[PDB]
């Protein structure tokens, strides 16, 4: 999702379905990457 | 009017200042609903007496 070379166009976009797995969201804070990171539905720190 | 009626949900999701906004709506309504209950019980208390 994040590290893909070229994403899908916003005119026609492919939605990535992710289920039945382990999601580690602490790596985002352990290593700063995103310039703009925000959450409307939840808090950015509560994803983990 | 709050995003969710469960306190644990808003606390595990929204930011600290954002949760207080939702907690205000939950406390406000629950306070009014309880005041309405006490009011009605006092009325019925006058009817039984």
UniProtKB/Swiss-Prot annotation, chain A:
Glycosylated residue positions: 3
Domain of life: Viruses
Impact reported for residue 33 to P: In strain: Omicron/BA.1, Omicron/BA.2, Omicron/BA.2.12.1, Omicron/BA.2.75, Omicron/BA.4, Omicron/BA.5, Omicron/BQ.1.1, Omicron/XBB.1.5, Omicron/EG.5.1
Effect of residue 6 to K: In strain: Mu/B.1.621
Function: Attaches the virion to the cell membrane by interacting with host receptor, initiating the infection. The major receptor is host ACE2. When S2/S2' has been cleaved, binding to the receptor triggers direct fusion at the cell membrane. When S2/S2' has not been cleaved, binding to the receptor results in internalization of the virus by endocytosis using host TFRC and GRM2 and leading to fusion of the virion membrane with the host endosomal membrane. Alternatively, may use NRP1/NRP2 and integrin as entry receptors.
SUBUNIT field: Binds to host ACE2. RBD also interacts with the N-linked glycan on 'Asn-90' of ACE2. Cleavage of S generates a polybasic C-terminal sequence on S1 that binds to host Neuropilin-1 (NRP1) and Neuropilin-2 (NRP2) receptors. Interacts with host integrin alpha-5/beta-1 (ITGA5:ITGB1) and with ACE2 in complex with integrin alpha-5/beta-1 (ITGA5:ITGB1). May interact via cytoplasmic c-terminus with M protein. May interact (via N-terminus) with host bilirubin and biliverdin, thereby preventing antibody binding to the SARS-CoV-2 spike NTD via an allosteric mechanism.
Protein name as catalogued: Spike protein S1
Natural source organism: Severe acute respiratory syndrome coronavirus 2
Gene name, Swiss-Prot/TrEMBL: S
Curated annotation (Swiss-Prot), chain B:
Documented effect of changing residue 11 to F: In strain: Omicron/BA.1
Effect on the protein upon substituting residue 12 to A: In strain: Alpha/B.1.1.7
Function: Subunit of the fusion protein that is processed upon entry into the host cell. Mediates fusion of the virion and cellular membranes by functioning as a class I viral fusion protein. Contains a viral fusion peptide that is unmasked after S2 cleavage. This cleavage can occur at the cell membrane by host TMPRSS2 or during endocytosis by host CSTL. In either case, this triggers an extensive and irreversible conformational change that leads to fusion of the viral envelope with the cellular cytoplasmic membrane, releasing viral genomic RNA into the host cell cytoplasm.
Protein name: Spike protein S2'
Source organism of the structure: Severe acute respiratory syndrome coronavirus 2
Organism phylogeny: Viruses, Riboviria, Orthornavirae, Pisuviricota, Pisoniviricetes
